[PDB]
């Protein structure tokens, strides 16, 4: 059994869904998520939810500068599956902020198969 997490990026005031908000995910060790293929090679992802399972990708933990950026799609959605447990705490860190917004505060989460909103304050 594996777990997933979804987020929806929204304007804090209007709740408009925001596209193109980019996030890195950190763990308690202060390392950041980098997806690889089964053979350790880098992969290209687009916006939205990433089906790690269907792609047989692997989760690895690297310096922030080397991490995968996960990006909200046109509906504001992003996330991934392939997490090993629902008990570990991670942090979603906004690194690429849409125009007209201030970054959301970092968001602690567990891979608990839920969806939650991440709010960007309009500038």
Author numbering: 176 to 298
Paper text:
As an alternative, GG-SpaA protein was fragmented by limited proteolysis as had been done previously for other backbone pilins. This produced a 15 kDa-sized fragment that can be crystallized in two different forms. Whereas the tetragonal crystals had diffracted to 2.0 Å and 1.6 Å resolution at home and synchrotron sources, respectively, the orthorhombic crystals showed diffraction to 2.0 Å resolution at both sources. In parallel, we solved the crystal structure of the tetragonal form with an advanced molecular replacement program using search models from distant homologs. As a pruned search template, the C-terminal domain of the S. agalactiae GBS52 pilin4 yielded an interpretable electron-density map for model building, though it offered less than 20% sequence identity. The structure of a 15 kDa fragment of GG-SpaA that had been generated by limited proteolysis is identical to that of the C-domain of full-length GG-SpaA (see preceding section for details). However, the electron density for the residues belonging to the extended C-terminal tail was not observed, with proteolytic removal as the likely reason.
As the first reported host of “non-pathogenic-derived” pili, Lactobacillus rhamnosus GG is a gut-adapted commensal lactic acid bacterium (LAB) and one of many clinically investigated probiotic strains for human use in the prevention and treatment of certain gastric ailments. As with other Gram-positive bacteria, sortase-dependent piliation in L. rhamnosus GG (called SpaCBA) is assembled from the ~30 kDa SpaA (backbone), ~20 kDa SpaB (basal), and ~90 kDa SpaC (tip-located) pilins. Two immunoglobulin (Ig)-like subdomains comprise GG-SpaA, each having the conserved residues of a canonical E-box motif and internal isopeptide bonds formed between either lysine and asparagine or lysine and aspartate residues. Our findings show that the GG-SpaA structure has certain features in common with other pathogen-derived pilin-proteins, such as the Ig-like CnaB-type folds and the presence of internal isopeptide bonds6940.
